Design a protein around this nucleic acid. Structure first.
Lengths: 615, 515, 86, 121
RNA sequence: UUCU
RNA sequence: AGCAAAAGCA
């Protein structure tokens, strides 16, 4: 015999047995090293697809920066970020025609958030890169450090606490020549436009890393506004992929293939594409969003038309700090030397590797105080919710009111993935309807990949790991987070464990069987951690004796808590109830007397505060 | 509220962020307001060349060619511990004696086998000094027999720092650090030896190592906790599926690994944080539960871990691993390429007929383990759940046809014949139980052999599948550029023998599905 | 960078939690079996009154004995779900 | 109605193994909890073990922990029991049972509906 | 630093 | 020595 699982696909189909392929071994691949050798690659590739554009030097920053917008048209099928400004607005204009007044209403719900927000809603975010210390810090301390700098000067209009008064300060700080931390005008701008790089780790579904970048402080407030606006705009739409998610997306995927599948003039083909756009971020240029933002904000007030307009101005002159650097060596003396990032602008080229010389060569011009400068593209991880509306406008062309021809389409779009559903009365009409989309989607700067895409008759396709057979929409959005202990306290972990399993059952598709078994592995990790094995178990540890003292001391043992002595009493019918309210009446008068004691000296008498140093 | 004027400085930035034929913001803003659709898009297309097009290359039953595997020397084993060749000493003790401290449960377990020869070398390493291991097995043995003469009841024995335990770990085999201002004078510099890895071929031993995992055993190997009582119907549907599952996987050799790759990692992780500088002796211990209801406490081998000054998320600690086995290293040497082979004695034993008196070997070798290839071991029990999520969905696919509950699939001992094997001259089938072990072992091996290559093959060996399944169902499929997909698959087949195997399973699925 | 592992490690060490001086006079120094739960590092600020988790389970088998019925009346929304299940 | 039979009973030397078995009919076997009680000669009965409708929640007497295992099979409507390393005083007649509640903990553990045809020495 |  | 891969821990 010679066992072979992937012969399983001869009887059972693929869309049902697809879970065999997901190896779930995507977490432990991490990044080994510093991670600058990749950031010198993304800067190069951003400048090879947009080389034809006229490049000029910028004022009060001293740096060249490319601009391929409105440039010539391509000839090769390779990627290209040569957009056309008279074409993008033409698409977003027709979006208003098919969807009346969608823009003027969406801005109104944002026109009040700008006046009804608070600065503290900013700090609830991911890690940031403060511009004072030149090191990644959390969102909590980076605000107190930068606001003290603003307070150090005469400007203290932040006292109102509104976020909009934090933006008036930075706007009133960027004009002063020298700042008092010392540092001049041309040295302070370069520090506020930075986007620190770092090699991406834990890539689930890719061979090699990606070299994402994290933003500063002043910039992350503006992008919160525009990201809010593109959320509402992409909420009222029908073919969205990013904001609509979870189990409700399971429904939207079947409505599209019901509308477009209605067979009038039943002599017509119906094909469906599964797609993936390559280099989605290397091509998009903020100069196009500035055309979009000022078109969304048509006839609106002036001050509100300004604030949203500011963020792409900063992305349009951005700069990416390089990593910690390289580490040379010598086998003779057997040492290692850590090179900084700035010295690469002065180090001799002969020590480096041959291909590492090819990177530094093309990047040798783009060097501003040990900091490269690029503006033909966007950085990974930054805002793209607005850039989903762009490709959606291409899905609007195809209602037969903009083609004036027999072929037509309509589809569904996440950021990097889509799916079209084409219709025409012969094979040849289909080959033209798709040849118009690959072309029309290139004038906007959104390339389509010809390796990660296939085509088939309708009834089955892929989209965002929501595999669709004729009527089955089995989803694999996110993997399982191990159902492990967190590490806060007794009563805290046991609440988090039996609610995450609840949410993963109604949001994702988690069966009734693999929710019980998951509750056996969680409690197995909860008892070993806190050493709370129940009495009748004959285990022995540094805590075991006193638990058996209480075990024999009580009458009805179903009332005790699991944290000390008691049994598990949950199932997949009552996960939405905390432990104490479940077995409250079940407890005897003795345990109940000592459990909820208002004179509890520890501090809910199980919830404590552990010893934390944060070394 | 009032922002009627932006500034005089950043205003100069915005005029530097506009399209080419624009040199002002106010003169550009009103151009947008004055925009109306005059059919610009149909004009640009009339200038785009005809070399920008998507030609439907139709898929057919003769287009997909087989993947071309690497060619080169055969591969080697790179597992943290042994898989099929292991050998375990046991006490066979209800109310096993030690039972709280692995050391005394290990020393007490060692007194069963006797007849230990003097140590003896069998096959050198071919790269490194071999006698520096032979002086460790004697070193550990004297420190082990020392306990019975001491009888102090120690919890764990920090070994000695002899030269023999100073080299195979490499305490001071590292280079020195200095800045560039002092190093620039040196003229022997180099970035690093970052180059392309070596291409390895496919060997046979990994097929004879996966079959033996999808095979029954005698014991249970796992004991899970309890839950409440079920009253609803949706719960009985779960308790019926899960109970049919657990009674078809507990008697499996792959669950031995799930509970062997936990006790090893968690003790190595708990000790290596509380005792950094000093060495230690960590016995590989696995606690079983046999047929008769009789506990056991087995022992697979010892471990010796060196210095561990770990501060960041990805540090490294290295250890030596001593493992018992009978597999005479003279038939598959390329598998035991990195292993040092000793000889300890002869297990005087007789088969059902005749006698063997076969030898008993040891496999010593160093290793390395970050602080994440340990935490990826203690969560192997997640592997069971990932093998049940598959079986559950395969049942709820039939649910769209009829009731299709689990009852009509698990029994009916031979009613569907799931084809999970390729015997010569055919595809021999088996019941769902043999499936519910094969999905598990494939899932366990995906954690032991975790690597970036496997993450890339599955991402690109999935689209070639769906394109095939649309052909067999006759939905008239098509692709755009095929040879760009193969070349992005073969780029991930370098040296890992697991990935180098799945490209022999996939390559034998096309030949039987008529491509 | 992960709290769970720090909860398994720190529980390997004795006296992981913290409480101020009121716990000191209430319970004894060590249990009858000898296991200690009232260590003291003699700090200047709060004296470092650190206690082992054994004091928790000890407090639930022996300690004060209150008669309040206030707690059932606070968690009312969580008590309303109890009747629907039954 | 309630039907409960026994099997596997037989004399055996000490320190030996044995496996009992039972059988049911006339009710939902996968919806009620079972126990095992034993009557020693000249002594009242007492509980030995319990088990739930999932096959999960098991308990035991204080004096027989680690030496008795209990396991049910809802499909064949049986209730096995494996006792290893039998003590000398364990010789007595064993009586099957059937709880009323699905769980085990609630209420006191005592037999309610059964007859112990099976015995052992 | 005991996951039967 | 080995870990493990496009650069780092020894």
């Amino acid at each position: 015999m010679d066992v072979n699982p992937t012969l399983l696909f001869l009887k059972v189909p693929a869309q049902n047995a697809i879970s065999t392929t997901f190896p779930y071994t995507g977490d432990p691949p991490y990044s080994h090293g510093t991670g600058t050798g990749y950031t010198m690659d993304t800067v190069n590739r951003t400048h090879q697809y947009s080389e034809k554009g006229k490049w000029t030097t910028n004022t009060e920053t001293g740096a060249p920066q490319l601009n391929p917008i409105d440039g010539p048209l391509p000839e090769d099928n390779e990627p290209s970020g040569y957009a056309q400004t008279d074409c993008v607005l033409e698409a977003m204009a027709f979006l208003e025609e098919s969807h009346p007044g969608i823009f003027e209403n969406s801005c109104l719900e944002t026109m009040e958030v700008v006046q009804q927000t608070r600065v503290d809603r900013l700090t609830q975010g991911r890690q940031t890169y403060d511009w004072t210390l030149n090191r990644n810090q959390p969102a909590a301390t980076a605000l107190a450090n930068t606001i003290e700098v603003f307070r150090s000067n005469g400007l203290t209009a932040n006292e109102s606490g509104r976020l909009i008064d934090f933006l008036k300060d930075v706007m009133e700080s960027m004009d002063k020549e020298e700042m008092e931390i010392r540092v001049n005008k041309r040295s302070y701008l370069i520090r506020a436009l930075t986007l620190n790089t770092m090699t991406k780790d834990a890539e689930r579904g890719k061979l090699k890393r990606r070299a994402i970048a994290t933003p500063g402080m002043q910039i992350r407030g503006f992008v919160y506004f525009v990201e809010t606006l593109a959320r509402s705009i992409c909420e009222k739409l029908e073919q969205s992929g990013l904001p609509v998610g979870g189990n409700e997306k399971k429904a939207k995927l079947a409505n599209v293939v019901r509308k477009m599948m209605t067979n009038s003039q039943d002599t017509e083909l119906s094909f469906t594409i599964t797609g993936d756009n390559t280099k989605w971020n290397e091509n998009q240029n903020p100069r196009m969003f500035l055309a979009m933002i000022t078109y969304i904000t048509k006839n609106q007030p002036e001050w509100f038309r300004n604030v949203l307009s500011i963020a792409p101005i900063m992305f349009s002159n951005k700069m990416a700090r390089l990593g910690k650097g390289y580490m040379f060596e010598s086998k003779s003396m057997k040492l290692r030397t850590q090179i900084p990032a700035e010295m690469l602008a002065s180090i001799d080229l002969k020590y480096f590797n041959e291909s590492t010389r090819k990177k530094i060569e093309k990047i040798r011009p783009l060097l501003i105080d040990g900091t490269a400068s690029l503006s033909p593209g966007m950085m990974m991880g930054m805002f793209n919710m607005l850039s989903t509306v762009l490709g959606v406008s291409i899905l609007n062309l195809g209602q037969k009111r903009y083609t004036k021809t027999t072929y037509w389409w309509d589809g569904l779009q996440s950021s990097d993935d889509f799916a079209l559903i084409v219709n025409a009365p012969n094979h040849e009409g289909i080959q033209a309807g798709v040849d118009r989309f690959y072309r029309t989607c290139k004038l906007v700067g959104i390339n389509m990949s010809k390796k990660k895409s296939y085509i088939n008759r309708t009834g089955t396709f892929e989209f965002t790991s929501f595999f669709y057979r004729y009527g089955f929409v089995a989803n694999f959005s996110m993997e399982l987070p191990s159902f492990g202990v967190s590490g806060i306290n007794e009563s805290a972990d046991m609440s988090i464990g039996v609610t995450v399993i609840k949410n993963n059952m109604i949001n994702n598709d988690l069966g009734p069987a693999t929710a019980q078994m998951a509750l056996q592995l969680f409690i197995k990790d909860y008892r070993y951690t806190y050493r709370c094995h129940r009495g009748d178990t004959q285990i022995q540890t540094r805590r075991s004796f006193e638990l058996k003292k209480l075990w024999e001391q009580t009458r009805s043992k179903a009332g005790l808590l699991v944290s000390d002595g008691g049994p598990n009493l949950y199932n997949i019918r009552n996960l939405h109830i905390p432990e104490v309210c479940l077995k409250w009446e079940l407890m005897d008068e003795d345990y109940q007397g000592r459990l909820c004691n208002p004179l509890n000296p520890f501090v809910t008498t199980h919830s404590w505060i552990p010893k934390r140093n944060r070394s | 509220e009032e922002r009627f004027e932006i500034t005089g400085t950043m205003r100069r930035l915005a005029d530097q962020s506009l399209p080419p034929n624009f040199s002002c913001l106010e003169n550009f803003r009103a151009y947008v307001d004055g925009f109306e659709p005059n059919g610009y898009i149909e004009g640009k297309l009339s200038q785009m060349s005809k070399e920008v097009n998507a030609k439907i290359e139709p898929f057919l039953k003769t287009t997909p060619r087989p993947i071309r595997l690497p060619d080169g020397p055969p591969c080697f084993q790179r597992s943290k511990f042994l898989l099929m060749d292991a050998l375990k000493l046991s006490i066979e003790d209800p109310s096993h004696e030690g039972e709280g401290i692995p050391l005394y449960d290990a020393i007490k377990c060692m007194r069963t086998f006797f007849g230990w020869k003097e140590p003896y070398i069998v096959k050198p390493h071919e790269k490194g000094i071999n006698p520096n291991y032979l002086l460790s097995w004697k070193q550990v043995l004297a420190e082990l027999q020392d306990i019975e003469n001491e009888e102090k009841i120690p919890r764990t024995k920090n070994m000695k720092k002899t030269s023999q335990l100073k080299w195979a770990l490499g305490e001071n085999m590292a280079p020195e650090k200095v800045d560039f201002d002092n190093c620039r004078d040196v003229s022997d510099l180099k970035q690093y030896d970052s180059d392309e890895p070596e291409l390895r071929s496919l060997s046979s031993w990994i097929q004879n190592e996966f079959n033996k995992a999808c095979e029954l055993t005698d014991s249970t190997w796992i004991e899970l906790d309890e839950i409440g009582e079920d009253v609803a119907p949706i719960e009985y549907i779960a308790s019926m599926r899960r109970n049919y599952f657990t009674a078809e996987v507990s008697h499996c050799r792959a669950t031995e690994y799930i509970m062997k790759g936990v006790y090893i990692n968690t003790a190595l992780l708990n000790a290596s944080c509380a005792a950094m500088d000093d060495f230690q002796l960590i016995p590989m211990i696995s606690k079983c539960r046999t047929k008769e209801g009789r506990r056991k406490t087995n022992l697979y081998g010892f471990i010796i871990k060196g210095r561990s000054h770990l501060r960041n998320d990805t540090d490294v600690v290295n250890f030596v691993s001593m493992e018992f086995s009978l597999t005479d290293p003279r038939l598959e040497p390329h598998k035991w390429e990195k292993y040092c082979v000793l000889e300890i004695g002869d297990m005087l034993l007789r088969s059902a007929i005749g006698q063997m008196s076969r030898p008993m070997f040891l496999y010593v070798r160093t290793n390395g383990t970050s602080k994440i290839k340990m935490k990826w071991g203690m969560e192997m029990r997640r592997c069971l759940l990932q093998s049940l999520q598959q079986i559950e969905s395969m049942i709820e696919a039939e649910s769209s046809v009829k009731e299709k509950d689990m009852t009509k699939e698990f029994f009916e001992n031979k009613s569907e014949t799931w084809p999970i094997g390729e015997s010569p001259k055919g595809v021999e089938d088996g019941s769902i139980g043999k499936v519910c072990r094969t999905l598990l072992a494939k899932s366990v091996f995906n954690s032991l052999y975790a690597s970036p290559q496997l993450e890339g093959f599955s991402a690109e060996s999935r689209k070639l599948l769906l394109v095939v399944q649309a052909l067999r169902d006759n939905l008239e499929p098509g692709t755009f550029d095929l040879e760009g997909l193969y070349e992005a698959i073969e780029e991930c087949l370098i040296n890992d023998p697991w990935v180098l195997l799945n490209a022999s399973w996939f390559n034998s699925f096309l030949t039987h599905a008529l491509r | 960078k992960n709290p769970s592992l720090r909860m398994k490690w720190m529980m390997a060490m004795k006296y992981p939690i913290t409480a101020d001086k009121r716990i000191t006079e209430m319970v004894p120094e060590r249990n009858e079996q000898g296991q200690t739960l009232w260590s003291k590092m003699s700090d200047a600020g709060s004296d470092r009154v650190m206690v082992s988790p054994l004091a928790v389970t000890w407090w639930n088998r022996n300690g004060p004995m209150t008669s309040t019925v206030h707690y059932p009346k606070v968690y009312k929304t969580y008590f309303e779900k109890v009747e629907r299940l039954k | 109605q309630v039907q409960l039979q026994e099997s596997g009973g037989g004399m055996v030397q000490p320190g030996g193994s044995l496996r009992l078995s039972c059988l049911a009919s006339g009710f939902t076997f996968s919806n009620y909890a079972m126990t095992w009680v034993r009557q020693a000669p000249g002594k009242g009965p007492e509980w030995v073990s319990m088990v739930s409708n999932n096959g999960a929640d098991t308990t035991y007497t204080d004096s027989v922990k680690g030496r008795f295992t209990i396991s049910r099979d809802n499909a064949k409507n049986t209730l096995y029991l494996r006792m290893n390393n039998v003590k000398p005083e364990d010789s007595a007649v064993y009586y099957c049972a059937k709880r009323r509640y699905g769980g085990i903990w609630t209420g006191q553990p005592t037999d309610y509906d059964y007859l112990g045809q099976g015995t052992v020495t």
